[PDB]
Design a protein around this nucleic acid. Structure first.
Ligand SMILES: [Mg+2]
Lengths: 626, 513, 116
RNA sequence: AGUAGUAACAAGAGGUAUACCUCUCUGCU
């Protein structure tokens, strides 16, 4: 016999045991080295889809920009960026017609949220580029450095603490032709062109630990001055996208399965004996490199129509900043020699003015193709978006295309509906014959080609309605299996005893709530977490036969106290947890079981040692880095 | 009221962020804000060319072709330890005054093997100085017997520095000093060379699903069960742990956990010496008496790790009884000595066999040691497959399908392909096979596996959509085939998984005639 | 990585930074041969490094104080406990916000009346 | 040599000066 697990699919459907085709227990792939090859590949691939635009030299930054929209219509199935803008304004007007009062209510609540936002709301979130250092930093440090450098020069409008005043300071700071920045010493002086290029810079790294890609890719982090406008625009688009029923974002958990079952219940309700219904499961190819920011400017100027003009300007800043962006090309390259047996490192700013006899064939071709885009070590990137920035406006545009296909609007022999999330879409098409379904697919695909949305012909497939997949939510006949998120390691997080205990139990609880964790898997996760906990803090049970540095005093504490079921795990007591009591912290679960001398020795405030938990002597503070 | 206006510099920026036929930002705002459409989309869709359409080609799995497997040399082993070939020296219920310290247990297991002959080479490393491997084993055998303490650190000899590769990294200069060498070039960035699928990895996955006579994984206690869903969960979990514990995949889990834990502790504690690390697992018998098994030694190198991908080299020396001269393509990386003789007194005969030692120079990183410390997730994930299928049968029957799913003492599930046809086993064989699949997905994990699984899931779902009479169809199937087939280069697990998909596709062809 | 940092920091002898007034209550040596504090300090802040045997020593042989305000200080956690333990369960019906991991699953559900 | 895979690790930052030196205890039955 030769063992084959895929033969399991001969007995069950594939939708039941699809969790065997997810190899998420080994290490995900990482990238060793520079992200310069990937970022130059992104720039070259972006300027090769919008090739028939118009090249205009930018007046201020001096960089060569490219304008794809209102351009020639495509004539193949390769991805193109030529989005006609009257079609974009038409789809936004139709989305306004189908939902009365939507854009006004979203804009009204955004204006309500603008005048009561403090500047420390920028401190939240992930890392951020810092142009005073040319380095990624935390958001709080980059914000503090930007406020300090603005305070040295004559820009102090953010003294009131608000955020719109800090954006006023940001816009006013482009006046200064004499920006002096203390660099590592000597305080160097930026000119106006250098500061204006440094403000519009995205810092590009390689995305590590991603699942489902053989070859790596590049992602980018925005600057500090462009974080606030992006936050306000994403707030408006978030307030819109929560009210379109065809938007998969930003909800999740059990409030996403209801959307799939709702659109299947709607679109397959009143089907006659002839009313065929098909379903396309589809991914979009090149979702980043084809949505132009000027299309987003037309969208945020059509959405905010009739609003006060300060609102239109404040929300229109972010596409204007994004259509002039540059890209920092990373950390150079590494050269070697095996005769003299030595290696060297070259930086990114030498790429435009080096001899090309040191590179291979393909990288020399890449430098020759990117050489005419260099501005002070950065490459101009006017066409195309980069990943992660505008995640809800793209969903708004896709929902507009899905809202084109109503019966009252089309008046054809086909109609459609469905869901769109980020760059993942599920489209349900009803018609009378199969050729009507084919013509409806053609109308959808050709309409998507007019706004930059490119359906991937390789990774999409169509069948009859009942089984499909939307962002790794697998729907079969009314049953949704969720495999969107990775099954996390249920180990300790590394704070202390009590903090890691409470964090682990609440993590298993929220995974049972959100990501469909079964009860038996939850019990085995409790077992694995307590096993790794008792190893990590050297706090195994009292009656054990092991030996560590704590087993002497743990042994004495076990033998001396009487009600042995009342000690905590870090005192070598028994694990009390099960499925019904994951939300209770450990000190409260064993309160009535503790003998009062042990409890009084535990929760004394006078000890020198000192998640929603109690405070005991186990809540100590670890050794800092020396 | 609120106020926001542009400065002149940002205004000259904003006049260049428009559609190309405009010239002023306020003019484009006035065009957008007073736009009344007149069916522009119909004019564009009548004006766009007719090559731009999503044509449907209908899917038929009785006509599609098999996935291609590449050509080259046979694929060789790349695991950190020997999987089905390793031999273990055992101590039953140890009490030797160290009692858990790994070097004391390694000495206690080494003293139960007499028959140390003079070590000679029987399979050479192809690109190595094999006398350095022989002298590394002789130096380790000398330095074990003279240890006084809890840790052994080796003397920095010449052959040990070659075997760990010290001094092989070239020097790092400034660019302005050496920019005038004719030999200077970029680091080599070729794609990997393709490899033909060999015949041993199917044997490894065969033997990694069979029961053994030990009880490997020992879980903790749980609280007092009260709720009925806790009783259902306890039923499912206790059947699974009763059926999955004694398999070899649990032994590989425990061995990988112990090796990577000891490697990370010696890397972050003593990051200067050549620290000898032993390979220990601890198990019980079916009678309950403890047992300590030793598999081999690992000599660490220097570990100045600052990134998450910086590599520490090590030398792994593992005992075995498999003569490597019968499958010699499997061991291109190794260097195999012959170090002893062992007496097998079994129920049939009473013979002697030579005991070999497999020596190789491997390397690992910090993220690989971290993810190898957490191989116990395999024991989770397979359960979350099997239990999930139970829920997948509870939503089309609307009852607790727990009990008529584990009390099915009958060969029901297909799991194999013999030369007689497709073979069926019980549900416990499925649990052991899914645990072995998760373990081998964690040992041989690479990027090609991610690409292959993520691109073959659509072929599985298309075949499933065909078999439910849902009439599937695709738009570009050759691109899907090429996107799968580019991710099959040289990993043995990816080549074996593509062979498994080819056999599944031929089986579902033969199902419907 | 903070988890790996905790794992290699607990392997060393002195991982816990205790306050500098620990020397007036608990001695240096153990009854079993372990050291409970050195005379080191932390990174700039004068807190003397200890071993976890000091924590277990305090838990088994510390100064007993009075703890009666904890049913009122951390009252919401004991409220969770009492609403769990005084509530009775029900059947598994195949087809509040706190226990939604317990009484509302992927396919099944469970009747659960709370305490009272 | 070896890990690995579209580019890297195979020690690096320094002092006197091509040789030395400061910094950057490990027990999962
Ligand atoms: Mg999709």
């Amino acid at each position: 016999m030769d063992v084959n697990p895929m033969l399991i699919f001969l007995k069950v459907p594939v939708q039941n045991a699809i969790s065997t085709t997810f190899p998420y227990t080994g290490d995900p792939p990482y990238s060793h080295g520079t992200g310069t090859g990937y970022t130059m590949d992104t720039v070259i691939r972006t300027h090769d889809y919008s090739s028939r635009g118009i090249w205009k030299t930018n007046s201020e930054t001096g960089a060569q920009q490219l304008n794809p929209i209102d351009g020639p219509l495509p004539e193949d199935n390769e991805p193109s960026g030529y989005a006609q803008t009257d079609c974009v304004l038409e789809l936004i007007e139709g989305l306004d017609r189908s939902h009365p009062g939507l854009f006004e209510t979203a804009c009204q609540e955004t204006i309500d949220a603008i005048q009561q936002t403090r500047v420390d709301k920028l401190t939240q979130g992930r890392q951020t580029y810092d142009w005073t250092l040319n380095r990624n930093q935390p958001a709080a440090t980059a914000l503090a450095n930007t406020i300090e450098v603005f305070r040295k020069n004559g820009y102090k409008l953010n003294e009131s603490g608000r955020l719109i005043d800090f954006l006023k300071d940001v816009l006013l700071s482009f006046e200064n032709d004499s920006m002096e920045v203390t660099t590592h010493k000597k305080r160097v002086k930026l000119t106006k062109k250098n500061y204006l290029i440094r403000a519009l810079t995205l810092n590009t790294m390689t995305k590590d630990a991603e699942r489902g890609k053989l070859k790596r890719r590049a992602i980018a982090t925005p600057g500090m001055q462009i974080r606030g406008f992006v936050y306000f625009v994403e707030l408006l688009a978030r307030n819109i996208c929560e009210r379109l029923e065809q938007s998969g974002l930003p909800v999740g958990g059990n409030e996403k399965k209801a959307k799939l079952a709702n659109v299947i219940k709607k679109m397959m309700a009143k089907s006659t004996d002839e009313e065929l219904s098909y379903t396309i499961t589809g991914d979009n190819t090149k979702w980043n490199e084809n949505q132009n920011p000027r299309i987003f400017l037309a969208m945020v100027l059509r959405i905010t129509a009739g609003q006060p003009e300060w609102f239109r300007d404040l929300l229109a800043v972010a596409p204007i900043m994004f259509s002039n962006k540059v890209a920092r090309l990373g950390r150079g390259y590494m050269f070697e020699s095996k005769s003299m047996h030595l290696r060297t490192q070259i930086s990114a700013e030498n790429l435009s003015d080096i001899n090309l006899r040191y590179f291979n064939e393909d990288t020399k071709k890449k430098i020759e193709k990117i050489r005419h885009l260099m501005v002070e070590g950065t490459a101009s990137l006017s066409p195309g978006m980069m990943m992660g920035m505008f995640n809800m406006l793209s969903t708004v545009l896709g929902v507009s295309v899905l809202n084109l296909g109503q019966r009252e609007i089309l008046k054809r022999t086909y109609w459609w509906d469905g869901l769109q999330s980020s760059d993942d879409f599920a489209l349900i098409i009803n018609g009378h014959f199969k050729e009507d379904i084919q013509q409806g697919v053609n109308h959808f695909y050709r309409t998507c080609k007019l706004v930059g949305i490119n359906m991937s012909q390789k990774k999409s497939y169509i069948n009859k309605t009942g089984t499909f997949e939307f962002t790794s939510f697998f729907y079969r006949y009314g049953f949704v299996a969720n495999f969107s998120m990775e099954l996390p390691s249920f180990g300790v997080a590394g704070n202390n005893e009590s903090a890691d205990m409470s964090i682990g139990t609440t993590v298993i609880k929220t995974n049972m709530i959100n990501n469909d964790l079964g009860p038996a898997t939850a019990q085995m996760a409790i077992q694995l977490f307590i096993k790794d906990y008792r190893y990590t803090y050297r706090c195994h049970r009292g009656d054990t036969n092991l030996e560590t540095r704590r087993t002497k005093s743990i042994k004495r504490l076990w033998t001396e106290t009487i009600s042995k079921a009342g000690l905590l795990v870090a005192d070598g007591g028994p694990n009390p947890y099960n499925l019904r009591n994951l939300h209770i912290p450990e000190v409260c679960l064993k309160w009535s079981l503790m003998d009062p001398d042990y409890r009084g020795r535990l929760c004394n405030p006078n000890n020198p040692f000192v998640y929603d938990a109690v405070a005991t002597t186990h809540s100590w503070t670890p050794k800092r880095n020396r | 009221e609120e106020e926001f206006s542009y400065p002149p510099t940002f205004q000259r920026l904003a006049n260049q962020s428009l559609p190309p036929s405009f010239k002023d930002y306020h003019q484009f705002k006035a065009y957008v804000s007073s736009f009344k459409a007149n069916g522009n989309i119909e004019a564009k869709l009548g004006a766009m060319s007719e090559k731009v359409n999503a044509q449907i080609e209908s899917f038929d799995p009785r006509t599609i072709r098999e996935l291609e497997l590449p050509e080259g040399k046979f694929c060789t082993q790349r695991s950190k330890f020997l999987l089905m070939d390793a031999m273990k020296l055992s101590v039953l219920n140890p009490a030797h005054e160290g009692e858990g310290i790994p070097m004391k247990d390694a000495k206690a297991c080494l003293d139960t093997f007499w028959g140390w002959k003079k070590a000679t080479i029987i399979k050479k490393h192809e690109k190595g100085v094999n006398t350095n491997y022989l002298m590394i084993w002789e130096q380790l055998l000398e330095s074990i017997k003279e240890m006084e303490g809890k840790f052994l650190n080796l003397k920095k000899t010449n052959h040990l520095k070659w075997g760990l590769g010290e001094g092989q990294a070239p020097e790092k200069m400034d660019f302005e000093d050496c920019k005038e060498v004719p030999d200077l070039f970029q680091y080599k960035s070729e794609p990997p060379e393709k490899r033909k699928l060999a015949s041993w990895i199917q044997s490894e996955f065969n033997k990694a699903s069979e029961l053994t006579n030990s009880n490997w994984i020992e879980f903790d206690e749980l609280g007092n069960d009260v709720a009925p869903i806790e009783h259902i969960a306890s039923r499912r979990r206790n059947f699974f742990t009763a059926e999955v514990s004694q398999c070899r995949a649990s032994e590989y889990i425990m061995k990988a956990v112990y090796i990577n834990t000891a490697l990370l502790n010696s890397s972050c504690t003593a990051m200067e010496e050549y620290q000898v690390i032993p390979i220990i697992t601890k198990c019980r018998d079916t009678s309950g008496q403890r047992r300590t098994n030793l598999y081999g030694f690992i000599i660490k190198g220097r570990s100045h790790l600052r990134n998450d991908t910086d590599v520490v080299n090590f030398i792994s020396l593992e005992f075995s009884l498999t003569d490597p001269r019968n499958e010699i393509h499997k061991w291109e990386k190794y260097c195999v000595l012959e170090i002893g003789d062992m007496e097998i007194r079994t129920s049939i005969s009473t013979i002697m066999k030579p005991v070999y030692l497999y020596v190789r120079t491997n390397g690992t990183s910090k993220i690989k040691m971290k993810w190898g410390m957490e191989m116990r997730r395999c024991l989770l994930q397979s359960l979350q497959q099997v239990e999930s299928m139970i829920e997948a049968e509870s939503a089309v029957k609307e009852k607790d399908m727990t009990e008529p799913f584990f009390r099915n003492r009958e060969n029901d599930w297909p799991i194999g392909e013999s030369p007689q046809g497709i073979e069926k086993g019980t549900i416990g064989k499925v649990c052991r096979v899914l645990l072995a699949k998760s373990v081998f997905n964690s040992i041989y994990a690479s990027a090609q596996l991610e690409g292959f699984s993520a691109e073959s899931r659509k072929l599985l779902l298309l075949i499933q959509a065909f078999r439910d009479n849902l009439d599937p169809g695709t738009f570009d199937l050759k691109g899907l085939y090429e996107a799968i087939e580019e991710c099959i280069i040289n990993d043995p697990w990816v080549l074996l998984n593509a062979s498994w998909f080819n056999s599944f596709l031929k089986a579902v062809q033969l199902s419907m005639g | 990585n903070p988890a790996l940092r905790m794992k290699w920091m607990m392997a060393m002898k002195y991982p816990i930074s205790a306050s500098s007034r620990i020397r007036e209550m608990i001695p240096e040596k153990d009854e079993d041969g372990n050291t409970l504090w050195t005379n080191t300090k932390d990174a700039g802040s004068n807190r003397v490094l200890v071993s976890p045997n000091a924590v277990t020593w305090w838990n088994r042989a510390g100064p007993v104080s009075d703890v009666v305000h904890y049913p009122r200080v951390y009252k919401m956690y004991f409220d969770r406990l009492e609403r769990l333990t005084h509530g009775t369960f029900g059947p598994v019906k195949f087809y509040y916000v706190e226990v939604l991991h317990l009484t509302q699953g992927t396919c099944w559900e469970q009747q659960y009346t709370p305490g009272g």
